[PDB]
Write a protein that binds this ligand. Structure first.
Ligand code: OGA
Ligand code: MG
Ligand code: NI
Ligand code: ZN
Length: 331
């Protein structure tokens, strides 16, 4: 069995190996990368996502989200308060302001300490989930707006044509902006490219141990757990590395820098935070190996998780017994 300790693997594909996306994901898996839940891919030196980032300031962040925490430093939830629209240029200025900028620090480890110690006492503003792409149309390799669609994958594997589309999303971050513990919709893969700016730290639980995390979360968020049998689908709960270590939950951590891709694997729980102003792009995708995960994925039917149009067909086809209850939660 490859990678039996479930360590995060880092890959350095050549320009020739960067041509065929599906084949390279399958290569990574042949080496055990999926066991960690997360892998890093450093593009060949010849590659670029686009020529420059000099002309992105007029992108609109229609609904910036202020991330307000409740709880204790290591065990907290966050809610998202909607703020007035602002441009990327306005957001970048805000991120760099004295109120929101990254504090002085020695290294990534010192910053991580300061995050966990102090996150709850601040409410950073995240420009998340913005439909769009920063890849140049002429970038042919690992262009997240030109991947094979999940609908086409389901059709190729299962023979059923379905409605729906699959497009990327932009995330503009600042110091302490936070992504809560989650897996993807329908336990899909995700791919994330950090276009520019400051790093993003990730934490991940191996897929084979995801239920250990779920059991801890039910213990630590007992009201939430009574409200919904899949409440981590709400994407609101944070648990620190210290707490995870105290409770014996297996996990790993890694920092992504500008110019690097991360891939999350089916049923790989992940969480993290941004170090300062940055812009990432991400999209879900599928492979043949995903289908069995999609068939087994938990679902939120309490009404909170509320998701895209395109998840309908996945539930309808892969989880017909669950469909009626899940759709009630959508409506
Ligand atoms: O970057 C973020 O805020 C969150 N990203 C992911 O959860 C992902 O790419 O799967
Ligand atoms: Mg612009
Ligand atoms: Ni994710
Ligand atoms: Zn729910």
């Amino acid at each position: 069995a490859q990678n039996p300790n479930c360590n995060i693997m880092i890959f350095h594909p050549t320009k020739e190996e960067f041509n065929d996306f599906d084949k390279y994901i399958a290569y990574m898996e042949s080496q055990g990368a999926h066991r960690a839940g997360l892998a890093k891919i450093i593009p060949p030196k010849e590659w670029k996502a686009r020529e420059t980032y000099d002309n992105i300031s007029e992108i609109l962040i229609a609904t910036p989200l202020q991330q307000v925490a409740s709880g204790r430093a290591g065990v907290f939830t966050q809610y998202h308060k909607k703020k007035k629209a602002m441009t990327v240029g306005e957001y970048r200025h805000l991120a760099n302001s004295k109120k929101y900028q990254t504090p002085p620090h020695q290294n990534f480890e010192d910053l991580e300490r300061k995050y966990w110690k102090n996150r709850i006492y601040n409410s950073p503003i995240y420009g998340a989930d913005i439909s769009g792409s920063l890849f140049d149309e002429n970038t042919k390799q690992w262009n997240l707006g030109h991947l094979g669609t999940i609908q086409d994958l389901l059709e190729k594997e299962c023979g059923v044509v379905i409605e729906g589309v699959n497009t990327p999303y932009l995330y503009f971050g600042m110091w302490k902006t936070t992504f809560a513990w989650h897996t993807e919709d329908m336990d899909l893969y995700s791919i994330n490219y950090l276009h520019l700016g400051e790093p993003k730290t990730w934490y991940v639980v191996p897929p084979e141990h995801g239920q250990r995390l779920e059991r801890l979360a039910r213990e630590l968020f007992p009201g939430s757990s009574r409200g919904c049998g899949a409440f981590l689908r709400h994407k609101v709960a944070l648990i620190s590395p210290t707490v995870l270590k105290e409770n014996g939950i297996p996990f790993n951590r890694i920092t992504q820098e500008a110019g690097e891709f991360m891939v999350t694997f089916p049923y790989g729980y992940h969480a993290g935070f941004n170090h300062g102003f940055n812009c990432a792009e991400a999209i879900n995708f599928a492979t043949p190996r995903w289908i069995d995960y999609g068939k087994m994925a938990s679902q939120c039917s309490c009404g909170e998780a509320r998701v895209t149009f395109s998840m309908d067909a996945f539930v309808r086809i892969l989880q017909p017994e669950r469909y009626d209850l899940w759709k009630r939660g959508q409506d």
